[PDB]
Design a protein around this ligand. Structure first.
Ligand SMILES: [Zn+2]
Length: 37
């Protein structure tokens, strides 16, 4: 069919979980996915 949205919500890459608000995600990333690189 038509090309609308490909899933507004974002999905972590490290844990590969589901999140509603992007804001929460970002924080979550550096929260647990904080590599000492
Ligand atoms: Zn994550």
């Amino acid at each position: 069919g038509s090309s609308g949205s490909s899933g507004i919500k974002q999905h972590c890459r490290f844990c590969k979980k589901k999140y509603s608000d992007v804001k929460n995600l970002i924080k979550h990333i550096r929260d647990m996915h904080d590599p000492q690189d």
